[PDB]
Amino acid sequence: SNTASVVVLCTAPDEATAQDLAAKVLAEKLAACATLIPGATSLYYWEGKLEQEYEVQMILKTTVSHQQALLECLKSHHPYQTPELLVLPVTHGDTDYLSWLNASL
Amino acid sequence: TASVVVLCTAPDEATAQDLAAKVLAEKLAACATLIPGATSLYYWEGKLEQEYEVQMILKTTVSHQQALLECLKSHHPYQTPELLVLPVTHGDTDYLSWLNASLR
Amino acid sequence: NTASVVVLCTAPDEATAQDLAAKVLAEKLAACATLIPGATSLYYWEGKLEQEYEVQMILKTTVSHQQALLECLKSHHPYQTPELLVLPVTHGDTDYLSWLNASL
């Protein structure tokens, strides 16, 4: 059987950072795959001020058994103090793809 | 305190940015990420439509999700825009703390 | 009114993504498909870091159709084993969800 999987959402200030973060967690085998979507814009209040920054949206694939380690790793290498680090559950997926995801870890 | 992620689409960046600033000011979401350059396909009144759109991803909590949806829906140019809620099973403690603190 | 879900699938290019979306829509296995080109997928293969420019697909459907959608998507997909993951929708705008269920 395959271990339950998840997708992790994280945002980086730019493409270089996003790729460095992705390369690192992939090497550490904490994620099986990482999708980087550049050209994004994030709006949020930071200490009372409305900010609007350019960001690269990251979507990382891994399993529940690695999510904790993945977030800890991402947070350490991330330039931001409190980066976006959210985990969404994958309730279902193609069996063979999930096997590859599991095998990659 | 359970966090959730909300999916919404807008016709252009101006409208998307307007929607975000609005819900952020009302403290119904802590953050909104906009992704332009997208395309949506769906049937409408019998024909397959293909529209250029901006994908929105907002972060909030279960306690605020309903109010967030109503507000977005109200200011959205469309009558029935995409408004979907996905559950967050885990997240960095500090980020989640910041998210909750940013809400109403 | 069946529970809805969102399906993530990655396509190698814009043409493939639109063809896949049109196909599943015609088959009534999804209600809507959002395509985000310009995405980069990173993963190890044969021992070396692969970097592919792809299209991120986000499809809307219900749990009663998730399995059929995945099978249709995989079959028409040019890759042998494309990314095919299902995320649950725990909530959403009532009218939107009704339209979603009705489109199926």
mmCIF file with all atom_site columns, all heavy atoms in Angstrom, chain A residues 19 26 33-36 61 89-94 96-97, chain C residues 39-42 51 66-67 74 82-84 86-88:
data_model
loop_
_atom_site.group_PDB
_atom_site.id
_atom_site.type_symbol
_atom_site.label_atom_id
_atom_site.label_alt_id
_atom_site.label_comp_id
_atom_site.label_asym_id
_atom_site.label_entity_id
_atom_site.label_seq_id
_atom_site.pdbx_PDB_ins_code
_atom_site.Cartn_x
_atom_site.Cartn_y
_atom_site.Cartn_z
_atom_site.occupancy
_atom_site.B_iso_or_equiv
_atom_site.pdbx_formal_charge
_atom_site.auth_seq_id
_atom_site.auth_comp_id
_atom_site.auth_asym_id
_atom_site.auth_atom_id
_atom_site.pdbx_PDB_model_num
ATOM 1   N N   . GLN A 1 19 ? 13.821  27.905 -6.417  1.00 0.00 ? 19 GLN A N   1
ATOM 2   C CA  . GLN A 1 19 ? 14.553  26.769 -6.952  1.00 0.00 ? 19 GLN A CA  1
ATOM 3   C C   . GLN A 1 19 ? 15.551  26.215 -5.938  1.00 0.00 ? 19 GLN A C   1
ATOM 4   O O   . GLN A 1 19 ? 15.725  25.008 -5.834  1.00 0.00 ? 19 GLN A O   1
ATOM 5   C CB  . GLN A 1 19 ? 15.265  27.163 -8.249  1.00 0.00 ? 19 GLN A CB  1
ATOM 6   C CG  . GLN A 1 19 ? 15.744  25.972 -9.071  1.00 0.00 ? 19 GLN A CG  1
ATOM 7   C CD  . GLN A 1 19 ? 16.196  26.364 -10.466 1.00 0.00 ? 19 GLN A CD  1
ATOM 8   O OE1 . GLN A 1 19 ? 15.455  27.010 -11.216 1.00 0.00 ? 19 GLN A OE1 1
ATOM 9   N NE2 . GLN A 1 19 ? 17.412  25.966 -10.827 1.00 0.00 ? 19 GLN A NE2 1
ATOM 10  N N   . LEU A 1 26 ? 14.256  18.328 -2.262  1.00 0.00 ? 26 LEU A N   1
ATOM 11  C CA  . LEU A 1 26 ? 14.262  17.178 -3.161  1.00 0.00 ? 26 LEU A CA  1
ATOM 12  C C   . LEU A 1 26 ? 15.501  16.332 -2.848  1.00 0.00 ? 26 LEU A C   1
ATOM 13  O O   . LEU A 1 26 ? 15.419  15.106 -2.728  1.00 0.00 ? 26 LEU A O   1
ATOM 14  C CB  . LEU A 1 26 ? 14.286  17.630 -4.631  1.00 0.00 ? 26 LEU A CB  1
ATOM 15  C CG  . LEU A 1 26 ? 13.007  18.272 -5.193  1.00 0.00 ? 26 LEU A CG  1
ATOM 16  C CD1 . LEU A 1 26 ? 13.206  18.688 -6.653  1.00 0.00 ? 26 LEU A CD1 1
ATOM 17  C CD2 . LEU A 1 26 ? 11.864  17.280 -5.088  1.00 0.00 ? 26 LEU A CD2 1
ATOM 18  N N   . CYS A 1 33 ? 8.386   15.918 -5.552  1.00 0.00 ? 33 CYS A N   1
ATOM 19  C CA  . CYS A 1 33 ? 8.314   16.824 -6.690  1.00 0.00 ? 33 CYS A CA  1
ATOM 20  C C   . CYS A 1 33 ? 7.953   18.218 -6.190  1.00 0.00 ? 33 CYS A C   1
ATOM 21  O O   . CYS A 1 33 ? 7.368   18.372 -5.119  1.00 0.00 ? 33 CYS A O   1
ATOM 22  C CB  . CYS A 1 33 ? 7.246   16.314 -7.678  1.00 0.00 ? 33 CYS A CB  1
ATOM 23  S SG  . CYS A 1 33 ? 6.928   17.365 -9.140  1.00 0.00 ? 33 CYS A SG  1
ATOM 24  N N   . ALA A 1 34 ? 8.325   19.234 -6.955  1.00 0.00 ? 34 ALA A N   1
ATOM 25  C CA  . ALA A 1 34 ? 8.013   20.605 -6.588  1.00 0.00 ? 34 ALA A CA  1
ATOM 26  C C   . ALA A 1 34 ? 7.620   21.374 -7.838  1.00 0.00 ? 34 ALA A C   1
ATOM 27  O O   . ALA A 1 34 ? 8.332   21.352 -8.837  1.00 0.00 ? 34 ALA A O   1
ATOM 28  C CB  . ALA A 1 34 ? 9.223   21.268 -5.923  1.00 0.00 ? 34 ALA A CB  1
ATOM 29  N N   . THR A 1 35 ? 6.472   22.036 -7.788  1.00 0.00 ? 35 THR A N   1
ATOM 30  C CA  . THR A 1 35 ? 6.011   22.834 -8.913  1.00 0.00 ? 35 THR A CA  1
ATOM 31  C C   . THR A 1 35 ? 6.167   24.301 -8.522  1.00 0.00 ? 35 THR A C   1
ATOM 32  O O   . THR A 1 35 ? 5.694   24.728 -7.465  1.00 0.00 ? 35 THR A O   1
ATOM 33  C CB  . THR A 1 35 ? 4.538   22.514 -9.250  1.00 0.00 ? 35 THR A CB  1
ATOM 34  O OG1 . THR A 1 35 ? 4.446   21.158 -9.700  1.00 0.00 ? 35 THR A OG1 1
ATOM 35  C CG2 . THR A 1 35 ? 4.011   23.437 -10.347 1.00 0.00 ? 35 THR A CG2 1
ATOM 36  N N   . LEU A 1 36 ? 6.871   25.057 -9.360  1.00 0.00 ? 36 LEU A N   1
ATOM 37  C CA  . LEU A 1 36 ? 7.101   26.479 -9.115  1.00 0.00 ? 36 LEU A CA  1
ATOM 38  C C   . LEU A 1 36 ? 6.282   27.294 -10.101 1.00 0.00 ? 36 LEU A C   1
ATOM 39  O O   . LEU A 1 36 ? 6.391   27.100 -11.311 1.00 0.00 ? 36 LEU A O   1
ATOM 40  C CB  . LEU A 1 36 ? 8.584   26.821 -9.289  1.00 0.00 ? 36 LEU A CB  1
ATOM 41  C CG  . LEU A 1 36 ? 9.634   25.952 -8.584  1.00 0.00 ? 36 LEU A CG  1
ATOM 42  C CD1 . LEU A 1 36 ? 10.974  26.645 -8.573  1.00 0.00 ? 36 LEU A CD1 1
ATOM 43  C CD2 . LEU A 1 36 ? 9.179   25.662 -7.158  1.00 0.00 ? 36 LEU A CD2 1
ATOM 44  N N   . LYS A 1 61 ? 5.102   18.113 -3.275  1.00 0.00 ? 61 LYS A N   1
ATOM 45  C CA  . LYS A 1 61 ? 4.456   16.821 -3.074  1.00 0.00 ? 61 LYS A CA  1
ATOM 46  C C   . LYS A 1 61 ? 5.270   15.895 -2.173  1.00 0.00 ? 61 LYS A C   1
ATOM 47  O O   . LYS A 1 61 ? 6.458   15.685 -2.402  1.00 0.00 ? 61 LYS A O   1
ATOM 48  C CB  . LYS A 1 61 ? 4.237   16.139 -4.424  1.00 0.00 ? 61 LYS A CB  1
ATOM 49  C CG  . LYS A 1 61 ? 2.954   16.543 -5.150  1.00 0.00 ? 61 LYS A CG  1
ATOM 50  C CD  . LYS A 1 61 ? 2.796   18.047 -5.309  1.00 0.00 ? 61 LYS A CD  1
ATOM 51  C CE  . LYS A 1 61 ? 3.871   18.648 -6.197  1.00 0.00 ? 61 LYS A CE  1
ATOM 52  N NZ  . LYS A 1 61 ? 3.765   18.205 -7.608  1.00 0.00 ? 61 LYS A NZ  1
ATOM 53  N N   . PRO A 1 89 ? -4.311  17.831 2.461   1.00 0.00 ? 89 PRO A N   1
ATOM 54  C CA  . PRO A 1 89 ? -4.386  16.383 2.267   1.00 0.00 ? 89 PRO A CA  1
ATOM 55  C C   . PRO A 1 89 ? -4.818  15.951 0.877   1.00 0.00 ? 89 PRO A C   1
ATOM 56  O O   . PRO A 1 89 ? -5.667  16.578 0.247   1.00 0.00 ? 89 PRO A O   1
ATOM 57  C CB  . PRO A 1 89 ? -5.403  15.959 3.308   1.00 0.00 ? 89 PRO A CB  1
ATOM 58  C CG  . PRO A 1 89 ? -6.421  17.083 3.196   1.00 0.00 ? 89 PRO A CG  1
ATOM 59  C CD  . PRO A 1 89 ? -5.541  18.339 3.103   1.00 0.00 ? 89 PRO A CD  1
ATOM 60  N N   . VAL A 1 90 ? -4.216  14.872 0.404   1.00 0.00 ? 90 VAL A N   1
ATOM 61  C CA  . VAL A 1 90 ? -4.584  14.307 -0.882  1.00 0.00 ? 90 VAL A CA  1
ATOM 62  C C   . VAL A 1 90 ? -5.447  13.115 -0.467  1.00 0.00 ? 90 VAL A C   1
ATOM 63  O O   . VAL A 1 90 ? -4.945  12.141 0.093   1.00 0.00 ? 90 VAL A O   1
ATOM 64  C CB  . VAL A 1 90 ? -3.344  13.823 -1.662  1.00 0.00 ? 90 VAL A CB  1
ATOM 65  C CG1 . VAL A 1 90 ? -3.770  13.098 -2.927  1.00 0.00 ? 90 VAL A CG1 1
ATOM 66  C CG2 . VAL A 1 90 ? -2.466  15.011 -2.021  1.00 0.00 ? 90 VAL A CG2 1
ATOM 67  N N   . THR A 1 91 ? -6.747  13.205 -0.709  1.00 0.00 ? 91 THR A N   1
ATOM 68  C CA  . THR A 1 91 ? -7.654  12.136 -0.323  1.00 0.00 ? 91 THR A CA  1
ATOM 69  C C   . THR A 1 91 ? -7.617  10.955 -1.284  1.00 0.00 ? 91 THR A C   1
ATOM 70  O O   . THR A 1 91 ? -8.034  9.850  -0.934  1.00 0.00 ? 91 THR A O   1
ATOM 71  C CB  . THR A 1 91 ? -9.105  12.647 -0.242  1.00 0.00 ? 91 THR A CB  1
ATOM 72  O OG1 . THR A 1 91 ? -9.378  13.452 -1.389  1.00 0.00 ? 91 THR A OG1 1
ATOM 73  C CG2 . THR A 1 91 ? -9.324  13.479 1.018   1.00 0.00 ? 91 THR A CG2 1
ATOM 74  N N   . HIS A 1 92 ? -7.123  11.188 -2.493  1.00 0.00 ? 92 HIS A N   1
ATOM 75  C CA  . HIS A 1 92 ? -7.123  10.174 -3.529  1.00 0.00 ? 92 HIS A CA  1
ATOM 76  C C   . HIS A 1 92 ? -6.190  10.571 -4.664  1.00 0.00 ? 92 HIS A C   1
ATOM 77  O O   . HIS A 1 92 ? -5.884  11.739 -4.872  1.00 0.00 ? 92 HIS A O   1
ATOM 78  C CB  . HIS A 1 92 ? -8.552  10.028 -4.054  1.00 0.00 ? 92 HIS A CB  1
ATOM 79  C CG  . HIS A 1 92 ? -8.661  8.771  -4.878  1.00 0.00 ? 92 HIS A CG  1
ATOM 80  N ND1 . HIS A 1 92 ? -8.369  7.536  -4.395  1.00 0.00 ? 92 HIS A ND1 1
ATOM 81  C CD2 . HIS A 1 92 ? -9.065  8.643  -6.211  1.00 0.00 ? 92 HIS A CD2 1
ATOM 82  C CE1 . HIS A 1 92 ? -8.596  6.686  -5.416  1.00 0.00 ? 92 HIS A CE1 1
ATOM 83  N NE2 . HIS A 1 92 ? -9.013  7.321  -6.515  1.00 0.00 ? 92 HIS A NE2 1
ATOM 84  N N   . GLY A 1 93 ? -5.749  9.610  -5.468  1.00 0.00 ? 93 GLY A N   1
ATOM 85  C CA  . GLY A 1 93 ? -4.924  9.930  -6.617  1.00 0.00 ? 93 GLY A CA  1
ATOM 86  C C   . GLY A 1 93 ? -4.684  8.687  -7.447  1.00 0.00 ? 93 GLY A C   1
ATOM 87  O O   . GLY A 1 93 ? -5.096  7.602  -7.049  1.00 0.00 ? 93 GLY A O   1
ATOM 88  N N   . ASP A 1 94 ? -4.047  8.836  -8.604  1.00 0.00 ? 94 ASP A N   1
ATOM 89  C CA  . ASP A 1 94 ? -3.748  7.675  -9.439  1.00 0.00 ? 94 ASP A CA  1
ATOM 90  C C   . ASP A 1 94 ? -2.781  6.765  -8.675  1.00 0.00 ? 94 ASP A C   1
ATOM 91  O O   . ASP A 1 94 ? -1.727  7.212  -8.232  1.00 0.00 ? 94 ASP A O   1
ATOM 92  C CB  . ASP A 1 94 ? -3.091  8.098  -10.751 1.00 0.00 ? 94 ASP A CB  1
ATOM 93  C CG  . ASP A 1 94 ? -2.618  6.906  -11.563 1.00 0.00 ? 94 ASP A CG  1
ATOM 94  O OD1 . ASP A 1 94 ? -3.475  6.094  -11.957 1.00 0.00 ? 94 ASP A OD1 1
ATOM 95  O OD2 . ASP A 1 94 ? -1.399  6.771  -11.792 1.00 0.00 ? 94 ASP A OD2 1
ATOM 96  N N   . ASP A 1 96 ? -0.547  4.446  -9.521  1.00 0.00 ? 96 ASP A N   1
ATOM 97  C CA  . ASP A 1 96 ? 0.837   4.424  -9.995  1.00 0.00 ? 96 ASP A CA  1
ATOM 98  C C   . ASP A 1 96 ? 1.607   5.709  -9.696  1.00 0.00 ? 96 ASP A C   1
ATOM 99  O O   . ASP A 1 96 ? 2.803   5.666  -9.393  1.00 0.00 ? 96 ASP A O   1
ATOM 100 C CB  . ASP A 1 96 ? 0.896   4.144  -11.495 1.00 0.00 ? 96 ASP A CB  1
ATOM 101 C CG  . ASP A 1 96 ? 0.386   2.761  -11.850 1.00 0.00 ? 96 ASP A CG  1
ATOM 102 O OD1 . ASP A 1 96 ? 0.324   1.903  -10.946 1.00 0.00 ? 96 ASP A OD1 1
ATOM 103 O OD2 . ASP A 1 96 ? 0.062   2.530  -13.033 1.00 0.00 ? 96 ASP A OD2 1
ATOM 104 N N   . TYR A 1 97 ? 0.938   6.852  -9.801  1.00 0.00 ? 97 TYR A N   1
ATOM 105 C CA  . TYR A 1 97 ? 1.610   8.113  -9.506  1.00 0.00 ? 97 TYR A CA  1
ATOM 106 C C   . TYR A 1 97 ? 1.943   8.146  -8.020  1.00 0.00 ? 97 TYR A C   1
ATOM 107 O O   . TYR A 1 97 ? 3.041   8.527  -7.634  1.00 0.00 ? 97 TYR A O   1
ATOM 108 C CB  . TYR A 1 97 ? 0.727   9.320  -9.855  1.00 0.00 ? 97 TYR A CB  1
ATOM 109 C CG  . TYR A 1 97 ? 1.427   10.639 -9.590  1.00 0.00 ? 97 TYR A CG  1
ATOM 110 C CD1 . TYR A 1 97 ? 2.495   11.057 -10.387 1.00 0.00 ? 97 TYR A CD1 1
ATOM 111 C CD2 . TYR A 1 97 ? 1.063   11.439 -8.506  1.00 0.00 ? 97 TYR A CD2 1
ATOM 112 C CE1 . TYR A 1 97 ? 3.186   12.233 -10.108 1.00 0.00 ? 97 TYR A CE1 1
ATOM 113 C CE2 . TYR A 1 97 ? 1.749   12.620 -8.219  1.00 0.00 ? 97 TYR A CE2 1
ATOM 114 C CZ  . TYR A 1 97 ? 2.807   13.008 -9.019  1.00 0.00 ? 97 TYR A CZ  1
ATOM 115 O OH  . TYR A 1 97 ? 3.494   14.164 -8.727  1.00 0.00 ? 97 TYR A OH  1
ATOM 116 N N   . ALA C 2 39 ? 4.547   27.107 -15.506 1.00 0.00 ? 39 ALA C N   1
ATOM 117 C CA  . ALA C 2 39 ? 4.978   26.483 -14.261 1.00 0.00 ? 39 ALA C CA  1
ATOM 118 C C   . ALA C 2 39 ? 6.202   25.611 -14.502 1.00 0.00 ? 39 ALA C C   1
ATOM 119 O O   . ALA C 2 39 ? 6.415   25.110 -15.603 1.00 0.00 ? 39 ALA C O   1
ATOM 120 C CB  . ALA C 2 39 ? 3.836   25.639 -13.657 1.00 0.00 ? 39 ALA C CB  1
ATOM 121 N N   . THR C 2 40 ? 7.020   25.448 -13.474 1.00 0.00 ? 40 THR C N   1
ATOM 122 C CA  . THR C 2 40 ? 8.212   24.619 -13.589 1.00 0.00 ? 40 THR C CA  1
ATOM 123 C C   . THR C 2 40 ? 8.120   23.477 -12.594 1.00 0.00 ? 40 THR C C   1
ATOM 124 O O   . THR C 2 40 ? 7.830   23.688 -11.416 1.00 0.00 ? 40 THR C O   1
ATOM 125 C CB  . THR C 2 40 ? 9.490   25.427 -13.301 1.00 0.00 ? 40 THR C CB  1
ATOM 126 O OG1 . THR C 2 40 ? 9.655   26.427 -14.311 1.00 0.00 ? 40 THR C OG1 1
ATOM 127 C CG2 . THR C 2 40 ? 10.709  24.525 -13.306 1.00 0.00 ? 40 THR C CG2 1
ATOM 128 N N   . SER C 2 41 ? 8.344   22.264 -13.082 1.00 0.00 ? 41 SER C N   1
ATOM 129 C CA  . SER C 2 41 ? 8.313   21.083 -12.242 1.00 0.00 ? 41 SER C CA  1
ATOM 130 C C   . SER C 2 41 ? 9.735   20.572 -12.037 1.00 0.00 ? 41 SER C C   1
ATOM 131 O O   . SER C 2 41 ? 10.477  20.364 -12.998 1.00 0.00 ? 41 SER C O   1
ATOM 132 C CB  . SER C 2 41 ? 7.453   19.996 -12.889 1.00 0.00 ? 41 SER C CB  1
ATOM 133 O OG  . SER C 2 41 ? 6.088   20.386 -12.925 1.00 0.00 ? 41 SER C OG  1
ATOM 134 N N   . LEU C 2 42 ? 10.106  20.382 -10.776 1.00 0.00 ? 42 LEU C N   1
ATOM 135 C CA  . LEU C 2 42 ? 11.432  19.893 -10.411 1.00 0.00 ? 42 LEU C CA  1
ATOM 136 C C   . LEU C 2 42 ? 11.297  18.566 -9.678  1.00 0.00 ? 42 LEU C C   1
ATOM 137 O O   . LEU C 2 42 ? 10.497  18.438 -8.743  1.00 0.00 ? 42 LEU C O   1
ATOM 138 C CB  . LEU C 2 42 ? 12.131  20.892 -9.493  1.00 0.00 ? 42 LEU C CB  1
ATOM 139 C CG  . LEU C 2 42 ? 12.436  22.274 -10.065 1.00 0.00 ? 42 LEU C CG  1
ATOM 140 C CD1 . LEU C 2 42 ? 12.665  23.247 -8.934  1.00 0.00 ? 42 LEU C CD1 1
ATOM 141 C CD2 . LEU C 2 42 ? 13.649  22.194 -10.974 1.00 0.00 ? 42 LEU C CD2 1
ATOM 142 N N   . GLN C 2 51 ? 14.155  19.512 -14.669 1.00 0.00 ? 51 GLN C N   1
ATOM 143 C CA  . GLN C 2 51 ? 13.472  20.799 -14.641 1.00 0.00 ? 51 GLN C CA  1
ATOM 144 C C   . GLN C 2 51 ? 12.648  20.931 -15.915 1.00 0.00 ? 51 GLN C C   1
ATOM 145 O O   . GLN C 2 51 ? 13.192  21.171 -16.993 1.00 0.00 ? 51 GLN C O   1
ATOM 146 C CB  . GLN C 2 51 ? 14.492  21.934 -14.554 1.00 0.00 ? 51 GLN C CB  1
ATOM 147 C CG  . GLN C 2 51 ? 13.929  23.241 -14.023 1.00 0.00 ? 51 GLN C CG  1
ATOM 148 C CD  . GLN C 2 51 ? 14.891  24.403 -14.204 1.00 0.00 ? 51 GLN C CD  1
ATOM 149 O OE1 . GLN C 2 51 ? 14.729  25.220 -15.112 1.00 0.00 ? 51 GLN C OE1 1
ATOM 150 N NE2 . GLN C 2 51 ? 15.901  24.480 -13.341 1.00 0.00 ? 51 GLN C NE2 1
ATOM 151 N N   . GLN C 2 66 ? -14.553 11.392 -9.286  1.00 0.00 ? 66 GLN C N   1
ATOM 152 C CA  . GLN C 2 66 ? -13.104 11.477 -9.194  1.00 0.00 ? 66 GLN C CA  1
ATOM 153 C C   . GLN C 2 66 ? -12.354 10.341 -9.871  1.00 0.00 ? 66 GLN C C   1
ATOM 154 O O   . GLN C 2 66 ? -11.426 10.588 -10.637 1.00 0.00 ? 66 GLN C O   1
ATOM 155 C CB  . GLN C 2 66 ? -12.642 11.611 -7.732  1.00 0.00 ? 66 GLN C CB  1
ATOM 156 C CG  . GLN C 2 66 ? -13.080 10.499 -6.789  1.00 0.00 ? 66 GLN C CG  1
ATOM 157 C CD  . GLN C 2 66 ? -12.521 10.678 -5.382  1.00 0.00 ? 66 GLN C CD  1
ATOM 158 O OE1 . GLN C 2 66 ? -12.501 11.790 -4.840  1.00 0.00 ? 66 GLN C OE1 1
ATOM 159 N NE2 . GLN C 2 66 ? -12.078 9.580  -4.779  1.00 0.00 ? 66 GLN C NE2 1
ATOM 160 N N   . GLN C 2 67 ? -12.751 9.100  -9.607  1.00 0.00 ? 67 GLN C N   1
ATOM 161 C CA  . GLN C 2 67 ? -12.055 7.966  -10.210 1.00 0.00 ? 67 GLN C CA  1
ATOM 162 C C   . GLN C 2 67 ? -12.162 7.955  -11.731 1.00 0.00 ? 67 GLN C C   1
ATOM 163 O O   . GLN C 2 67 ? -11.172 7.719  -12.419 1.00 0.00 ? 67 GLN C O   1
ATOM 164 C CB  . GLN C 2 67 ? -12.583 6.643  -9.648  1.00 0.00 ? 67 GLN C CB  1
ATOM 165 C CG  . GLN C 2 67 ? -11.852 5.424  -10.178 1.00 0.00 ? 67 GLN C CG  1
ATOM 166 C CD  . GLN C 2 67 ? -10.345 5.531  -10.016 1.00 0.00 ? 67 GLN C CD  1
ATOM 167 O OE1 . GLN C 2 67 ? -9.843  5.769  -8.920  1.00 0.00 ? 67 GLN C OE1 1
ATOM 168 N NE2 . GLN C 2 67 ? -9.615  5.349  -11.112 1.00 0.00 ? 67 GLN C NE2 1
ATOM 169 N N   . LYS C 2 74 ? -5.663  10.348 -17.299 1.00 0.00 ? 74 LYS C N   1
ATOM 170 C CA  . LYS C 2 74 ? -4.440  9.572  -17.488 1.00 0.00 ? 74 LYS C CA  1
ATOM 171 C C   . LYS C 2 74 ? -4.365  8.959  -18.880 1.00 0.00 ? 74 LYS C C   1
ATOM 172 O O   . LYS C 2 74 ? -3.319  8.994  -19.530 1.00 0.00 ? 74 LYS C O   1
ATOM 173 C CB  . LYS C 2 74 ? -4.347  8.461  -16.437 1.00 0.00 ? 74 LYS C CB  1
ATOM 174 C CG  . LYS C 2 74 ? -3.023  7.690  -16.447 1.00 0.00 ? 74 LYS C CG  1
ATOM 175 C CD  . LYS C 2 74 ? -3.059  6.586  -15.404 1.00 0.00 ? 74 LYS C CD  1
ATOM 176 C CE  . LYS C 2 74 ? -1.744  5.838  -15.300 1.00 0.00 ? 74 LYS C CE  1
ATOM 177 N NZ  . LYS C 2 74 ? -1.834  4.811  -14.211 1.00 0.00 ? 74 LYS C NZ  1
ATOM 178 N N   . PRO C 2 82 ? 1.281   10.593 -15.313 1.00 0.00 ? 82 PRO C N   1
ATOM 179 C CA  . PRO C 2 82 ? 1.218   12.010 -14.940 1.00 0.00 ? 82 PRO C CA  1
ATOM 180 C C   . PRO C 2 82 ? 0.776   12.235 -13.503 1.00 0.00 ? 82 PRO C C   1
ATOM 181 O O   . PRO C 2 82 ? 0.203   11.352 -12.857 1.00 0.00 ? 82 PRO C O   1
ATOM 182 C CB  . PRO C 2 82 ? 0.200   12.576 -15.917 1.00 0.00 ? 82 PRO C CB  1
ATOM 183 C CG  . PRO C 2 82 ? -0.758  11.422 -16.086 1.00 0.00 ? 82 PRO C CG  1
ATOM 184 C CD  . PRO C 2 82 ? 0.183   10.240 -16.233 1.00 0.00 ? 82 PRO C CD  1
ATOM 185 N N   . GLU C 2 83 ? 1.043   13.436 -13.008 1.00 0.00 ? 83 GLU C N   1
ATOM 186 C CA  . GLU C 2 83 ? 0.624   13.801 -11.667 1.00 0.00 ? 83 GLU C CA  1
ATOM 187 C C   . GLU C 2 83 ? -0.893  13.841 -11.699 1.00 0.00 ? 83 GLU C C   1
ATOM 188 O O   . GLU C 2 83 ? -1.477  14.490 -12.561 1.00 0.00 ? 83 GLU C O   1
ATOM 189 C CB  . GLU C 2 83 ? 1.160   15.189 -11.291 1.00 0.00 ? 83 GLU C CB  1
ATOM 190 C CG  . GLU C 2 83 ? 0.689   15.683 -9.928  1.00 0.00 ? 83 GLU C CG  1
ATOM 191 C CD  . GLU C 2 83 ? 1.419   16.942 -9.485  1.00 0.00 ? 83 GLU C CD  1
ATOM 192 O OE1 . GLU C 2 83 ? 2.669   16.935 -9.463  1.00 0.00 ? 83 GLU C OE1 1
ATOM 193 O OE2 . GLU C 2 83 ? 0.744   17.936 -9.161  1.00 0.00 ? 83 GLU C OE2 1
ATOM 194 N N   . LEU C 2 84 ? -1.523  13.132 -10.769 1.00 0.00 ? 84 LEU C N   1
ATOM 195 C CA  . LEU C 2 84 ? -2.977  13.082 -10.672 1.00 0.00 ? 84 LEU C CA  1
ATOM 196 C C   . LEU C 2 84 ? -3.322  12.935 -9.194  1.00 0.00 ? 84 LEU C C   1
ATOM 197 O O   . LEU C 2 84 ? -3.287  11.831 -8.649  1.00 0.00 ? 84 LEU C O   1
ATOM 198 C CB  . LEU C 2 84 ? -3.531  11.884 -11.456 1.00 0.00 ? 84 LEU C CB  1
ATOM 199 C CG  . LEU C 2 84 ? -3.574  11.969 -12.984 1.00 0.00 ? 84 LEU C CG  1
ATOM 200 C CD1 . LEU C 2 84 ? -4.028  10.617 -13.568 1.00 0.00 ? 84 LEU C CD1 1
ATOM 201 C CD2 . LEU C 2 84 ? -4.528  13.082 -13.403 1.00 0.00 ? 84 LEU C CD2 1
ATOM 202 N N   . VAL C 2 86 ? -6.062  14.178 -5.904  1.00 0.00 ? 86 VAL C N   1
ATOM 203 C CA  . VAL C 2 86 ? -7.366  14.717 -5.547  1.00 0.00 ? 86 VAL C CA  1
ATOM 204 C C   . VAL C 2 86 ? -7.316  15.386 -4.165  1.00 0.00 ? 86 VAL C C   1
ATOM 205 O O   . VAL C 2 86 ? -6.821  14.801 -3.193  1.00 0.00 ? 86 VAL C O   1
ATOM 206 C CB  . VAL C 2 86 ? -8.457  13.608 -5.536  1.00 0.00 ? 86 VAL C CB  1
ATOM 207 C CG1 . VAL C 2 86 ? -9.832  14.227 -5.298  1.00 0.00 ? 86 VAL C CG1 1
ATOM 208 C CG2 . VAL C 2 86 ? -8.451  12.849 -6.862  1.00 0.00 ? 86 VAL C CG2 1
ATOM 209 N N   . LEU C 2 87 ? -7.816  16.620 -4.106  1.00 0.00 ? 87 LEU C N   1
ATOM 210 C CA  . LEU C 2 87 ? -7.888  17.408 -2.869  1.00 0.00 ? 87 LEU C CA  1
ATOM 211 C C   . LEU C 2 87 ? -9.373  17.603 -2.559  1.00 0.00 ? 87 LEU C C   1
ATOM 212 O O   . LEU C 2 87 ? -10.168 17.886 -3.452  1.00 0.00 ? 87 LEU C O   1
ATOM 213 C CB  . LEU C 2 87 ? -7.226  18.776 -3.064  1.00 0.00 ? 87 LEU C CB  1
ATOM 214 C CG  . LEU C 2 87 ? -5.809  18.855 -3.649  1.00 0.00 ? 87 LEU C CG  1
ATOM 215 C CD1 . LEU C 2 87 ? -5.324  20.287 -3.698  1.00 0.00 ? 87 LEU C CD1 1
ATOM 216 C CD2 . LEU C 2 87 ? -4.878  17.999 -2.799  1.00 0.00 ? 87 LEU C CD2 1
ATOM 217 N N   . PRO C 2 88 ? -9.767  17.449 -1.286  1.00 0.00 ? 88 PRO C N   1
ATOM 218 C CA  . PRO C 2 88 ? -11.167 17.609 -0.905  1.00 0.00 ? 88 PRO C CA  1
ATOM 219 C C   . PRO C 2 88 ? -11.612 19.047 -0.696  1.00 0.00 ? 88 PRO C C   1
ATOM 220 O O   . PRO C 2 88 ? -10.851 19.892 -0.231  1.00 0.00 ? 88 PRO C O   1
ATOM 221 C CB  . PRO C 2 88 ? -11.251 16.817 0.392   1.00 0.00 ? 88 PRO C CB  1
ATOM 222 C CG  . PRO C 2 88 ? -9.931  17.194 1.037   1.00 0.00 ? 88 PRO C CG  1
ATOM 223 C CD  . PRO C 2 88 ? -8.950  17.055 -0.121  1.00 0.00 ? 88 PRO C CD  1
#
